[PDB]
Amino acid sequence: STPELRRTWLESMAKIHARNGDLSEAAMCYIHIAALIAEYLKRKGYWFSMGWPAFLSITPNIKEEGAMKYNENILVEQLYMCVEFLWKSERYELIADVNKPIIAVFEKQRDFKKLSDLYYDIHRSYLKVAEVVNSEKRLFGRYYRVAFYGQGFFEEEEGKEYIYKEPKLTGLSEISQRLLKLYADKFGADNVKIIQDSNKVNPKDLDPKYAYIQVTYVTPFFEEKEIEDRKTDFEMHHNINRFVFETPFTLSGKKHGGVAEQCKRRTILTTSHLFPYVKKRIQVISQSSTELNPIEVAIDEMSKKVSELNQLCTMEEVDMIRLQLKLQGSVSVKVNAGPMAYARAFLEETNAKKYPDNQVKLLKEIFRQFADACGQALDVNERLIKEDQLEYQEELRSHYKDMLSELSTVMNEQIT
Amino acid sequence: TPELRRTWLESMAKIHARNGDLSEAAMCYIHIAALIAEYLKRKGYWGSMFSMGWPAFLSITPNIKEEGAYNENILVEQLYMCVEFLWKSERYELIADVNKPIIAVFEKQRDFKKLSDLYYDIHRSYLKVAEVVNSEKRLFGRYYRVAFYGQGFFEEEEGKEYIYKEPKLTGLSEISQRLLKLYADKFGADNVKIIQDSNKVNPKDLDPKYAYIQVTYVTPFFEEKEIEDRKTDFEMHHNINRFVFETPFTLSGKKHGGVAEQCKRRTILTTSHLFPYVKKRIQVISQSSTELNPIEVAIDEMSKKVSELNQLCTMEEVDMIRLQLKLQGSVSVKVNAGPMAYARAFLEETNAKKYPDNQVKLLKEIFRQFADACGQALDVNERLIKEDQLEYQEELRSHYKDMLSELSTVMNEQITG
Amino acid sequence: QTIKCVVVGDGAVGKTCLLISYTTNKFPSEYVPTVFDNYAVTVMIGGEPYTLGLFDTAGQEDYDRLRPLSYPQTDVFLVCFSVVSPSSFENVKEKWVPEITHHCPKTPFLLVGTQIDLRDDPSTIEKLAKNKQKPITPETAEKLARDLKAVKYVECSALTQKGLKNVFDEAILAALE
Amino acid sequence: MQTIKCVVVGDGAVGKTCLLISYTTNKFPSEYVPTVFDNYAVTVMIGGEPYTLGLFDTAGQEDYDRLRPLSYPQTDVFLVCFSVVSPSSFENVKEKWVPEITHHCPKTPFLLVGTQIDLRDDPSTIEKLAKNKQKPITPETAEKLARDLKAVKYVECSALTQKGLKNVFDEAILAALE
Ligand SMILES: Nc1nc2c(ncn2[C@@H]2O[C@H](COP(=O)(O)OP(=O)(O)O)[C@@H](O)[C@H]2O)c(=O)[nH]1
Ligand SMILES: Nc1nc2c(ncn2[C@@H]2O[C@H](COP(=O)(O)OP(=O)(O)O)[C@@H](O)[C@H]2O)c(=O)[nH]1
């Protein structure tokens, strides 16, 4: 909470982040520095002028810089470092709001060449966005809940939950083995275990003679009310603090069971600050969760499959292999239970009496859309296959027709 | 650091003592004793003995685990203070557990007079409990969910949800206005608004021009497994971290509607520490929710009504007025829809086809218990009325049979009593 | 040891919303509907907690036959009216106070003004003006409360929840003489 | 030319479905919600350009032998799986699976995949093979089969510990590109 104590810390993190390739965190460190300098000059009377609120368009996390107990040239130098790392981190959309206050500085000096430079650099920042936005080219990161358990072992990290923002496409394999090696050395490789269960750990269940690291993949979470914003790949990683994951549980008490006993829990973790932050891990401060019963699970995955099929069939250049993957995995399931196990468990007359009418009626309507979407996908495939997939297509149709016949028996309705 | 933690707990205990929050003053002294014990142990000074460190106090409260992150006489002084405030806060049940480590000390010292006195103190606390248990004379407090929204106003409270433990029977408006004026004097009187809706707030729907304080009444929550261990008024306020509240919604997205559309969300909040604690307000760190369909709401309300009518008939001495209140309000409904609205909506042949068989048969069974519970309540009531209520009781019976006449038609089954 | 309190008044004044407001300790936006009639609330009168049984009554004319059967054993009555509905008040005098005084001549009662949030509402004030009407003042209602020998007169709003706690506190003090 | 078709074969109960779900969802096997559909897709980066890796899941049982080769046309790479704690699944690699894919797709590269490698250091597992007079399949004996049968290479993994899992699909992508 001391100006230069906080400032050297942020500059240290900036350099660490730059070496580690956490380039957004580096950009954040510099914008937090610039925010601090601005608040300090404001409090120590200097006459941008609002203090730390000057950079709220960049991130609301800088509110914490106003917990404080340096000239205009160096504030601007902090902003240049910030733009460098926004460029390197591909968060091009923020470059404009960092340069705007610099522009105001140089407007006053009549430096027309500098102004030409600043407007130019906001120009390719938006050109780059025009070239890459929504093209799945930008790898802003993957997110993992990480929790540490073992009061005989862990220092400050004991009993607390983090969201780790990992680079690009880091998979579960890599962050697990990494964290395991890290804490196998400061505590001993014989006394550290990874918790794979994604339920909230209860410490009494754990051997106090061991240290545990729970690792669970999570994804940024938005509800339909927020999808008004969050229209781009950038916005899906810009100032976010909610993260979702699902956990399977049966009615009995197991993780896995049959279609009629399979539930799942939906958990949403909130973080103390927003990503991106001056750190690549942020602590979780709360959890909200809901549950879906077996007919709700079935309703959920059947809707998704209908949307997957329709999406592929309305692409400009339909992706034949990706269409077949989903089509064959809908109409000719051979390893899993197949979508007809849903129809048998929830739509047959005897079984349907055990569930709410509205939910039975919703799952019936989805299956109709499923029939159409498998049909539309079979037609799109026919216009794309060559001679070597004619038998393949004929069996898909044969499997589809056999499925509509059984579906028609079960629903007692003609499904075209 | 132990020193700063101990100075803070000692300050909080005096502040709590000064404001009359005596349960929280008692908890501060048990935490100080936990902190000193762990300190002396980690230095090597030497169930339920101080030697164990903080784990010795785990039966009093699991909250003292956090103390695990100067004489033995001083430890005893902390526990005396706790007992004193345990007495004043009427948490007499706790006194036996706080005295155990004190007893262990004087056992080793062979201070048999002192052991005489401590076992005498425990005897008088259970004598006190025997005189007040579940009389509704003990008022351990009311709980409120309180959450703060205001990115431009609130400091550390911003975006965080707390359970506030309020004194005695503080009602919803009291804490609401108190929270309003408190933050209207730190902000602008025209910039603070109370969020009335109890659904989880999404920040997007808020105007940053004002600060928002969401206030909802909650009660301690236990599942059917727990209810065995939550028999008394003390037990229902002792070492609790789960609170529940219900929110009305309809199938179509409104809040209120007809009994065949009226749903109910049940939210369960969990706090980071257990009440009673060293503070009156504890952060919510967890919430889960679940949705009751209209027939499930019916099941819920009918089982409650059956149960409360049953325990009004099986009381030692029966509250005749409370018995007539509940009974008249079941068999002579004239303002609200009356419990036959549930029967018509869910149990009639054509309507029952829209709901699960198991829930329809369960709602049917509960209604049979409801017929028996009103029957039992009518018989108890006429053992207790004077001549001024014979005509009133007569019209309760006529209504009870007109109800059983309709329930028999709807269930297609003779319902006798 | 439960205090019996019967509440009377012609409908739409807010009797029932008032009672479920304060009993369930909820904002009116948030209360779960109930199929049952009557309410029981626990109250504090200087350290001593009490149980107030609240017997609701349907105010319509069809029930004038049997509604007085709830009157025996009453400890206090509440006669209600809406501060923006004049005939809600005009017929407190014409029908309600004669009826409850006839059946229980020695039981105390209070005059209660409800929906006070809508007397300081602009839309509501003009809807009254077109009918050649204006909201009833406290003073005119306190005039009347003295006229017919009520204990006192109180005002409440379940939307504000301001003044409502006072209504029931005064009811209990009345039932304790 | 946006999507890699990879087809997975092997006997039942070697863990192939469980292998594909964990890599495709980035979850541990116990934590995925069971699905009633077949096949899995995951985006994979080639030189900074986004590709779909399509994973086609096949049933290894005899009842499926007639229709399974209809999925082989257009395949870019095969994963031939066996569990290292099931010598029968290992022998059927030589005696069933490699011949079947060789016959329908003789020019299509395939990888030999050992699964369930965590069970190689399991007492109950190593003992349960002792009572059956069998021993677990060592990595060295599995690389010799890979060279004999003209496999592009051998890879082991465990879906439970995630050890070696990522490298299997790294190796599969590189073979799928030719
Ligand atoms: N604005 C406002 N409306 C109210 C209040 N109390 C009740 N109401 C409304 O008045 C209507 C009828 O009131 P009700 O509770 O049925 O009173 P009753 O008919 O005499 O039992 C309902 O639609 C309520 O929402 C209040 O304090 N303020
Ligand atoms: N210990 C262990 N068990 C596994 C592994 N992979 C799969 N299993 C289990 O092996 C059983 C069969 O695997 P399954 O997914 O059906 O493989 P498939 O029959 O080839 O599709 C299941 O009970 C899995 O939990 C692994 O890596 N380690």
C-alpha to C-alpha distances, C102 to C95, C98, C106, C156, nearest whole angstrom? 11, 6, 10, 27
The pair of structure tokens assigned to C177 is 């003489």
Token pair 């209860």 is at which residue? A202
- Contact between A328 and D166 using a beta-carbon 8 Å cutoff: no
Of chain A residues 357-396, which have a CB less than 8 A from chain B?
357-358
Q: What are phi and psi of D173, to 5 degrees?
A: -60, -50
Peptide bond into B276 cis (omega under 30): yes
Pick from B136, B335, B388: CB nearest C73: B388
- Contact between C35 and B255 using a beta-carbon 8 Å cutoff: no
Query: Taking a C-beta distance cutoff of 8 angstroms, is the pair B249, B272 a contact?
Result: no
Number of domains in chain C: 1
What is the per-residue DSSP string for chain C?
-EEEEEEE--TTSSHHHHHHHHHHT--GGGPPP-SS--EEEEEEETTEEEEEEEE----SGGGGTTGGGG-TT-SEEEEEEETT-HHHHHHIIIIIHHHHHHH-TTS-EEEEEE-GGGTT-HHHHHHHHHTT--PPPHHHHHHHHHHTT-S-EEE--TTT--SHHHHHHHHHHHHT-
Strand segments, DSSP code E, in A88-234 are: 142-149, 161-166, 192-195, 211-220
Distance CA B162, CA B5 (A): 22
Chain B positions in Cβ-Cβ contact with residue C162 (cut-off 8 Å): 173, 177
Interior angle at CA A225, CA A224 and CA A231, nearest 5: 70
Looking at chain C, which residue has its C-alpha nearest residue B262? Answer: C33
- B412 exposure class (CB count in 10 Å sphere: 0-12, 13-18, 19+): exposed
User: How far off is chain A from D133, nearest CA to CA, in Å?
Assistant: 31
Distance CA C44, CA B351 (A): 45
Single out the residue of A256, A268, A264, A255 nearest to residue A218, CA to CA.
A268
Preceding-residue numbers of gaps in chain A (C–N over 2.5 Å):
47, 69
Distance CA A358, CA A351 (A): 14
Structural determination approach = X-ray
Distance CA A338, CA A332 (A): 8
> Does the annotation place C115 within a ligand binding site?
yes
Single out the residue of C75, C132, C141, C148 nearest to residue C114, CA to CA.
C141
What would you report as the CA-atom Rg of chain D, rounded to the nearest whole angstrom? 16
Q: Ligand 2 centre from D14 Cα, in Å?
A: 6
Single out the residue of B267, D3, D160 nearest to residue A312, CA to CA.
D3
Q: What are phi and psi of B17, to 5 degrees?
A: -55, -40
Q: Ligand 2 centre from A401 Cα, in Å?
A: 32
> Does the annotation place D10 within a ligand binding site?
yes
Q: CA-based diameter of chain D, in Å?
A: 52
- B72 exposure class (CB count in 10 Å sphere: 0-12, 13-18, 19+): middle
Neighbours of B56 (CB within 10 A): 23
Burial state string for D6-16 with b = 16 or more CB within 10 A and e = fewer than 16: bbbbbbeebbb
Chain B positions in Cβ-Cβ contact with residue A223 (cut-off 8 Å): 202
Distance CA D124, CA B197 (A): 57
Is the pair D, A in contact (3+ CB pairs within 8 Å)?
yes
The pair of structure tokens assigned to A42 is 């404001």
Chains touching chain C through at least 3 C-beta pairs below 8 angstroms are B
Task: Tell whether B356 is within 8 A of chain A (Cβ).
Answer: yes
Fill in the amino acid letter for B375: G
Query: Taking a C-beta distance cutoff of 8 angstroms, is the pair A356, B293 a contact?
Result: yes
Fill in the amino acid letter for C26: K
- Contact between A319 and D22 using a beta-carbon 8 Å cutoff: no
Burial state string for A160-171 with b = 16 or more CB within 10 A and e = fewer than 16: ebbbbbbbeebb
**DSSP H or E segment with residue A308:** helix A294-313
Query: Taking a C-beta distance cutoff of 8 angstroms, is the pair B45, B72 a contact?
Result: yes
Query: Taking a C-beta distance cutoff of 8 angstroms, is the pair B366, A366 a contact?
Result: no
- A70 exposure class (CB count in 10 Å sphere: 0-12, 13-18, 19+): middle
**Structural domains in chain B?**
1-137 (1.25.40.410), 139-292 (no CATH), 293-414 (1.20.58.740)
Strand segments, DSSP code E, in B196-276 are: 211-220, 240-250, 262-275
Task: Tell whether C46 is within 8 A of chain B (Cβ).
Answer: no
Of chain A residues 147-206, which have a CB less than 8 A from chain B?
151, 158, 200
- Contact between C161 and B330 using a beta-carbon 8 Å cutoff: no
Q: Which atom of ligand 2 is nearest to the CA of D11?
A: 20
Single out the residue of C32, C99, C113, C26 nearest to residue C68, CA to CA.
C99
Neighbours of A301 (CB within 10 A): 18
Token pair 């729970």 is at which residue? A214
Strand segments, DSSP code E, in B98-190 are: 142-149, 161-166
Q: What are phi and psi of B246, to 5 degrees?
A: -105, 140
User: Whose Cα sits closest to atom 9 in ligand 1?
Assistant: C14
User: How far off is chain C from B287, nearest CA to CA, in Å?
Assistant: 19
Chains touching chain A through at least 3 C-beta pairs below 8 angstroms are B, D
Fill in the amino acid letter for A190: D
Interior angle at CA B325, CA B323 and CA B327, nearest 5: 65
Length of chain D (residues): 178
Strand segments, DSSP code E, in B37-156 are: 142-149
Residues enclosing ligand 1, CB less than 6 A? C 9, 11-18, 114-115, 117-118, 157-159
> Does the annotation place C64 within a ligand binding site?
no
Looking at chain B, which residue has its C-alpha nearest residue C6? Answer: B325
Which DSSP state fits D93? I
Query: Taking a C-beta distance cutoff of 8 angstroms, is the pair A212, A195 a contact?
Result: yes
> Does the annotation place D60 within a ligand binding site?
yes
Chain A positions in Cβ-Cβ contact with residue B284 (cut-off 8 Å): 286
- A355 exposure class (CB count in 10 Å sphere: 0-12, 13-18, 19+): buried
Distance CA A393, CA A388 (A): 10
Chains touching chain B through at least 3 C-beta pairs below 8 angstroms are A, C
Single out the residue of A166, A305, A136 nearest to residue A236, CA to CA.
A136
**DSSP H or E segment with residue D54:** strand D49-57
Domain that holds residue D103: 1-178
Single out the residue of B327, B324, B391 nearest to residue C4, CA to CA.
B324
State CA B109 to chain mean position distance: 42
Q: Ligand 2 centre from D59 Cα, in Å?
A: 14
Distance CA A399, CA A386 (A): 20
Neighbours of B18 (CB within 10 A): 9
Ligand with the closest atom to the CA of D55: 2
Peptide bond into D106 cis (omega under 30): no
Q: Ligand 1 centre from C14 Cα, in Å?
A: 4
CATH code of the domain covering residue C148: 3.40.50.300
Single out the residue of A164, A195, A193 nearest to residue A180, CA to CA.
A193
